[PDB]
Each structure stands twice: as C-alpha cells, then as structure tokens.
Amino acid sequence: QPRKKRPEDFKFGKILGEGSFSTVVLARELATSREYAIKILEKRHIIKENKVPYVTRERDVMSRLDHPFFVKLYFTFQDDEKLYFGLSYAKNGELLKYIRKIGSFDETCTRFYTAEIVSALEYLHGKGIIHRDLKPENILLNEDMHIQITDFGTAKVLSSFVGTAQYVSPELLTEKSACKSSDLWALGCIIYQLVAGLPPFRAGNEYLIFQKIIKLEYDFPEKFFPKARDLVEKLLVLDATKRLGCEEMEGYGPLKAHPFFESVTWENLHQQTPPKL
C-alpha cells in the first residue's frame, strides 16, 4: 500500500457539502493533480455524540463498494483532531439540482436515470446492504453525467435511524425496522419526483408528511407517463413484501422486466451516453 497520505499532500479548496457530523471539501492532490472530495470529521465531536458506530459503518460499507454507480473510497488518514475520507468527486453535483433546474424529466431521461438507480440498488442489495436514506440529494452526477450514489453513514449491513421525511418508508413509521424493500419505496418516490417535479408526499411538517405516508395519501398529475405510473404504483405499496423488486416478489428480474424499462439495455448502462438534460 502507498504511504498514508496527510493534509499537507493536498491543496484544499471550496466546501462542497456540510453533512451530519462532517464537512466535505474539494481537494487537489499536489503529487498527482487529482481532485478528491475529502470528507472531514472531527474525532471529539464524533465521540461526544456517540457516533463511532456511525462512522465505523460508513467506512466499512464504502470499503466494500466497487461499482461505477457508487462513491469510491480511495484512502483514509487522520491527524490529532480529524478523520479524512478521500472520496470520488462528483463534478456535476446533486440530481436534485437538475430536477429543480429543468423542473421535471422527459420520459427518456426519467427511464435512463431510473435504470441507473435500479441497477445500483441491485448491486448494493446483492451485497446485503440497505442505504436507508436514498434521495436525489444523495444521488450525485459525475462529469460524464452518470450517477454516483453517496452517503453511507446511515446504511445498514444485513445479518435505529430514520431518514429524510419525504422518502421514509411506512415500515419505519410503524415498526422501527428497515429492509431492502425500504430502498425500493424510496425509488418509487424518486421516480415520481423525476416525472412530476416534486416528491409524492408533501405537507407543512414532518408529522403531517408521516401521516400521508402511512395512509398512502398521494396522487398522480394528469400527464404522468402511464408506464412510469404503473411502476410507481408497484413500488409505493404499504406492505413491504409486495413491492416490485423485493425478494418476496422474486427480486430484480421482474423489476427490470417492467414495461417502463422495455427499451433499456441493463448490461452496460455505464458505457451508454446519458440523454441530455
């Protein structure tokens, strides 16, 4: 292994994001001229907030990921005060940014980007990992406009936490429990959001949002692509064992065979050129 890196190896630049117990800063490695997104965490603060398990899980999950649709962990190091995670830099920022920029996606772009997420979730779920906080804020875009999923501090490794209100699955509200199917619920909310321009469940506060979620209280705009609508109806299902893509429904095959995805070639999405937004 190369010698441990250290802060003085980098020219630090702008802050890219100010996460839960961390700050992500753009950094250029002097020796190589490579750009990394370095996640910086203060040890004392992590210890004080009882987040050692949190940070340990984050690093352990990220070390296991080796797929182009996920953030990559290249290196770690620490000094007296801080932990540093050297992560891939997603040049084009958040999916959410593009949703707001152009309002909503046409069918071709919805299909292409939904497929990348599904394909990413298939990989993740095959390793026994649940994300638990999947959302357009955490789905980044690379320079090449392919997705790069991030934010694994709150992930669960199969064999205690509630995500972002608008994407929380009903089972989390009624049991405290999460499963792979919880990510598929999030996927349904995201597809709806790509097409409609807004998340399905919206209200004045978390309480009222949680209320709508458990009553499955939402509806589709008039223009909603019919096959995407059918797909979302098969994902936004209160019973977690009946969502398209979960094990009880025989996995990712039937999800990927959905009519909405008819024209998708699943084997080499990362080699395809994304539709212009």
Ligand SMILES: O=C1NCCc2ccccc21
């Ligand atoms: O580009 C990024 N890569 C790592 C994850 C991240 C978080 C917040 C802002 C940017 C990034």
